[PDB]
DNA sequence: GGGGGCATGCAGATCCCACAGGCGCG
DNA sequence: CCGCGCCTGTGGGATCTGCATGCCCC
C-alpha cells in the first residue's frame, strides 16, 4: 500500500487506461467504467493506484492477468475530478471528454428517458471503436471525427508514469561479424500508435535527444521513439527517471538498466568478468 | 415488485514491448 | 579496421476494449 504522484498516475493512464461506456438492451441499460488490465507481475501498480483514488475493485482475469475496475457512479467523480486537475495527453483525452459528458447525462438522471440514450449512443459512436452492428442498426440516425487532441509532454512526472506503461529499457548484445567481440548497447524506446505522432515527436525537444522511426504507411500504424547514443542515455535519459521514479516492474528494469550503464561508463564491459554480469543483467529482465 | 445499479465474470482486437540486422561514418 | 549508432524491420502477447449476466436493493 502506497500512493503515487498524480502526474505519474495520469501518465500511466495515458498508456494503459481505458474509458468504457456500455449500452446493452427495449430496456437499454448503461454502464460507465474506467478499467486497467495488466500482467500479474504489475499488480502493485493497480493496488498503488487504488490506494491513491480509494476506489475500484482489483480482480484476477485468468492465471496471468490482474484487472482494476471502477464502475460505481459516485466513485467515478473522483476520477473525473482528478483528470480535470491532471489532464490526459494522448488521444485518450478525447475518450475522456466523451466519458465526462456521458457522466453528466447520467448525473441529471436523464440517461433513462428516451431523450437520454439517444445522446449517449451519439456520444458512444465517437469514443473508442464506436458502436456495434446491432445498435448501429438500432440507431442508423446517429449524427455527430471528434476534435483531435494535440498536446506535448506536460512534465517529466507524466513521462515516468507513461514510460512505466508503453516504455522499454533493454540491453543489446551484438557479436561483431568482423571482430567476434561482444558489443554492449543500451537503448530506450517508446512505441505508440501514429495517432499521437505529434506527442511522440515532442519527446525529442523535451528530452534533448532521440529519433522517430515510422515505416511505410501501408504496413504499420504505430511508430517508435528511440534513444541509442550512449552519451544521451547516460546524461539525459537516466537523470530524468532518477528524479521521476518509475512504477511497477519498469522501475526494476530501469535499475538493472542503470547498472549496465555504469559498467560501461567504467569501461568494465570490455572485461570478461564485467561482460558476465551484464549477461545476467540481461536474463534478470526477461524473468 | 422490479428497475436500475453494482459486482463479476469471459473474450475479442491490437497496440504495444523487446528486440534484430545492415551498414555508413568518424 | 573498429566500435558507435543511425536506420530498417518484427514476433507475439500484454495489453486496450467489449459483451454478458445473475444478484441486490430500494
Ligand atoms: Ca498504450
Ligand atoms: Ca505495459
Amino acid at each position: 500500500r502506497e500512493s503515487i504522484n498524480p502526474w505519474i498516475l495520469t501518465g500511466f493512464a495515458d498508456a494503459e487506461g481505458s474509458f468504457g461506456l456500455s449500452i446493452l438492451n427495449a430496456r437499454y441499460h448503461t454502464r460507465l467504467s474506467f478499467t486497467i488490465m495488466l500482467h500479474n507481475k504489475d499488480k502493485s501498480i493497480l493496488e498503488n493506484i487504488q490506494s491513491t483514488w480509494k476506489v475500484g475493485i482489483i480482480t484476477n482475469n485468468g492465471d496471468h492477468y490482474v484487472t482494476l475496475r471502477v464502475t460505481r457512479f459516485e466513485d467515478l467523480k473522483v476520477i473525473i475530478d482528478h483528470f480535470e486537475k491532471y489532464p490526459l495527453v494522448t488521444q485518450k483525452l478525447g475518450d475522456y471528454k466523451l466519458f465526462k459528458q456521458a457522466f453528466s447525462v447520467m448525473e441529471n438522471k436523464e440517461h433513462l428517458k428516451e431523450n437520454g440514450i439517444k445522446e449517449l449512443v451519439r456520444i458512444k459512436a465517437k469514443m473508442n471503436w464506436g458502436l456495434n452492428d446491432e445498435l448501429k442498426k438500432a440507431f442508423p440516425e446517429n449524427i455527430s471525427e471528434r476534435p483531435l487532441i494535440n498536446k506535448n509532454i506536460p512534465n517529466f512526472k507524466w513521462l515516468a508514469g507513461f514510460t512505466s506503461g508503453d516504455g522499454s529499457f533493454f540491453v543489446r548484445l551484438r557479436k561483431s561479424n568482423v571482430n567476434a567481440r561482444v558489443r554492449v548497447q543500451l537503448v530506450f524506446e517508446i512505441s505508440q500508435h501514429i495517432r499521437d505522432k505529434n506527442l511522440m515527436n515532442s519527446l525529442i525537444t523535451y528530452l534533448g535527444c532521440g529519433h522517430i522511426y515510422e515505416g511505410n504507411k501501408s504496413e504499420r500504424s504505430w511508430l517508435q521513439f528511440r534513444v541509442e547514443k550512449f552519451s544521451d542515455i547516460n546524461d539525459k535519459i537516466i537523470p530524468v527517471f532518477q528524479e521521476n521514479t518509475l512504477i511497477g516492474v519498469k522501475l526494476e528494469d530501469f535499475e538493472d538498466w542503470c547498472k549496465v550503464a555504469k559498467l560501461i561508463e567504467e569501461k568494465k564491459h570490455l572485461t570478461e568478468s564485467g561482460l558476465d554480469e551484464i549477461k545476467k543483467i540481461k536474463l534478470n529482465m526477461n524473468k
Side-chain angles (χ1 to χ4, degrees), chain A residues 3-23 26 28 30-40 42 44-53 55-62 64-71 73 75-76 78-84 86-99 101-107 111-112 116-117 119-121 123-130 132 138-140 144 147-174 180 183-218 220-258 260-266 269 272-282 284-286:
Chain A
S3 62
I4 52 182
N5 178 278
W7 282 114
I8 296 181
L9 161 50
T10 294
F12 190 85
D14 261 314
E16 322 272 50
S18 185
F19 295 91
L21 162 61
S22 186
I23 298 174
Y28 280 111
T30 85
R31 179 82 292 193
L32 217 60
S33 63
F34 174 81
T35 58
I36 301 180
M37 168 142 55
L38 311 173
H39 192 272
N40 285 350
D42 267 342
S44 62
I45 292 183
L46 302 179
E47 312 197 279
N48 222 334
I49 275 171
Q50 145 171 268
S51 299
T52 306
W53 280 348
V55 301
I57 305 99
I58 295 178
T59 88
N60 279 88
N61 182 325
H64 309 327
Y65 307 135
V66 282
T67 311
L68 154 69
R69 306 229 266 183
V70 181
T71 181
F73 194 86
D75 280 16
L76 285 178
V78 59
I79 289 185
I80 298 183
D81 280 328
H82 161 82
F83 281 117
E84 286 297 317
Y86 308 91
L88 291 141
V89 155
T90 62
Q91 297 311 303
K92 188 172 301 299
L93 180 67
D95 298 278
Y96 163 80
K97 291 219 160 226
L98 304 175
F99 168 88
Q101 52 191 101
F103 178 86
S104 59
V105 164
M106 299 172 56
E107 190 178 26
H111 75 278
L112 299 170
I117 81 153
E119 263 64 20
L120 289 151
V121 166
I123 292 178
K124 162 142 194 48
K126 307 302 296 180
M127 59 177 291
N128 282 178
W129 297 339
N132 84 333
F139 303 89
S144 186
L148 320 172
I149 321 297
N150 303 153
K151 312 288 185 174
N152 303 325
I153 312 105
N155 60 81
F156 279 132
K157 285 168 183 170
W158 173 94
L159 183 60
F162 189 72
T163 303
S164 300
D166 302 331
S168 178
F169 311 90
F170 55 102
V171 184
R172 283 265 282 159
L173 299 175
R174 296 196 61 178
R183 197 202 314 171
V184 163
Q185 164 82 334
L186 290 190
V187 47
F188 164 64
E189 190 184 278
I190 306 180
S191 60
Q192 197 77 3
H193 191 278
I194 52 98
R195 72 180 194 180
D196 284 285
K197 170 178 173 176
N198 315 94
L199 161 67
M200 303 296 292
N201 207 279
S202 66
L203 293 168
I204 302 180
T205 169
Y206 202 86
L207 288 167
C209 61
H211 300 258
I212 294 293
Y213 302 115
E214 312 212 22
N216 284 124
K217 301 189 172 71
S218 69
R220 194 140 94 257
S221 288
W222 55 269
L223 44 78
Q224 299 158 105
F225 169 79
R226 191 188 303 168
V227 183
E228 299 183 292
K229 177 189 275 289
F230 173 82
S231 62
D232 285 327
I233 276 183
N234 195 27
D235 311 309
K236 299 173 183 174
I237 302 298
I238 285 181
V240 160
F241 296 113
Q242 278 179 324
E243 177 62 42
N244 309 268
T245 62
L246 300 139
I247 59 182
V249 298
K250 277 293 160 55
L251 180 66
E252 311 187 32
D253 292 334
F254 171 76
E255 290 169 350
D256 301 334
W257 205 58
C258 294
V260 179
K262 221 42 188 181
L263 294 177
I264 301 165
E265 196 176 356
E266 299 182 332
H269 64 296
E272 196 70 44
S273 181
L275 207 47
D276 285 10
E277 200 198 342
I278 295 177
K279 284 181 181 175
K280 174 31 165 177
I281 309 185
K282 196 175 174 305
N284 54 342
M285 308 173 306
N286 304 332

